[PDB]
């Protein structure tokens, strides 16, 4: 049905008109989730499950309380809030690609694509979009904001069943979202986590991406610098498992929503600088559950197995020549000093922050928006 | 029960034990098997060579077979073997045993690993009582459940627990049975680490045979072995890192659904074996783990290597085996180790290589396993 929505006017010059989209999880799925949460079994007490500092992962107490709270979690109000933002799909290379957008009425608004990672989603950027739409009407908005679901995530389909799919494929498909919207003349990319790999690939390989801002630069100490990571030794189990046995873990965590909550909840707890509320965790895990995201979402991790000859960020093949900005958040998983980041591209913008961790947009929306705006205004050349 | 007479000289009488899972536990299992949801089709789940783990089709078929799986006959077979428990350091320690009537029978402890259990050794015990009566049996065979596994309780809730603790507790099973004058240990997987610790640190353990020597390097077969070891190190060690760094997360996640546990453990029975392990055997092991809440209690050993020591356990002079040491090479072990490697880790007096068999040597090749065990004990036992 036709639904007028503010900020939803497709930019002049779009070559393909996207299909309007709204989230409508069925009543039967909501009923089922409540049942499956209730009946999920909990592990018995163990020494590891009793460590309140989470040294061995989530605690039994956290999970029991989360299970109890999930019983009274109501998806419908969250879904209504999601549906207050314009959403669309395109069909690209046989994939359905979902995206949230705020479109400006200005002919020459600066197009920006914001790229989530794992175990996130477009939800990470909704607080930022709220700030944007409160400050700007469609008529005063300086930017077009596109927040796509990567292939395999939430309402995006795929990846394909019959061929391998990697970060370069991901970037090619996301670039086509921007091309379809008429942004061949230029857009800015912003990324964290896996989205920072995608954003780097867009900037290095795709003409339409003119500049890139990252809040994550997964790297070791660069070899070109002559003469703290609890993450490589203790925090990388999920990477090895996702990268070597994605089918096993995907099959395992499809069985019960509480299995999925255990695996993903650990990361929302440990990776954030600002504490992420339980409701936010439940919202994201619930969305992953309804859309069967997890098994489809982990294809990127196998690019690290066997270990590449050079890390992606440390490879001249992926050095960013276009204008490159970086924001340093102190509770990022591998915080990278400016001298490190500078070895990986033409770094024209640097901003450090006193607060915030891995989920920068979700934890510190105003800092994230201030940085993004400042970067685009500094580098955009018309 | 034949083979159940406690050896003379035992200083603690063990308590007889039988498995009797309640109908309520059986039906809770079937409820949660039926409640489990399947993954969507994925590229990774369609790879028949299992390059990314189990296939979705294997899991769906295994779940369907589980709905028709009858625990009662498997339980009756378990209960056909003498079983006991001891209370040691506040833990209930379960064990299977075959006791000889010979007064000076050689005592042997067989040590399972993860994701195994005493079930791994039941084919060997079957071969033993088919070959020997209680009067001709040359050995006392003890097959304990490690702390945290199946019918053994623990590990403690309030303190850390490691391989040296495991070895100390297992040694006390043998001491309780009167074997302070000497026993032989045999181990694979984690049981190979326990066996090494017994031999190095515990007076009563007089010799040790291993079918696993997790180590790095200190011809065509050596080439095929190196390729397998590299595959295991590069692609097979996710479970080690996850168990070793986030045991509470994975323990909680897989406890929620028996089919989650089946996915995680089934992958290993498929990939680690040389001889194909029947689905029924996988279901029996995973079912036993489920009824006893084994998985979250069973993975404490993995964190010993985080952070990694500069010297792996087998390669550390602190753990060099000076007592008589035997090794059997099975080509589909996870890190197949040539003799020149193994010899650097102990007083290797016995070496046997096999054409067939992988990681679960006793379960896959019970006759080879028993032949090696008899040959090693006869070679090294000194009264």
Automatic annotation (TrEMBL), chain B:
Source organism superkingdom: Eukaryota
GO molecular-function terms, A-Z: cis-stilbene-oxide hydrolase activity
Every Epoxide hydrolase N-terminal domain range: 15-121
Gene Ontology biological process terms, A to Z: epoxide metabolic process
Keywords annotated in UniProt: Hydrolase
TM helices/strands, residue ranges: none
Pfam families, A to Z: EHN
E.C. number: 3.3.2.9
Active site residues per record: 189 (nucleophile), 302 (proton donor), 359 (proton acceptor)
Matches recorded under InterPro entries: AB_hydrolase_fold, Epox_hydrolase-like, Epoxide_hydro_N, Epoxide_hydrolase
Similarity annotation: Belongs to the peptidase S33 family.
PANTHER family linked: EPOXIDE HYDROLASE 1-RELATED (PTHR21661), HYDROLASE, PUTATIVE (AFU_ORTHOLOGUE AFUA_3G08960)-RELATED (PTHR21661:SF39)
Designated name of the protein: Microsomal epoxide hyddrolase
Organism whose genome encodes this protein: Aspergillus usamii
Gene symbol of the encoding locus: EH2
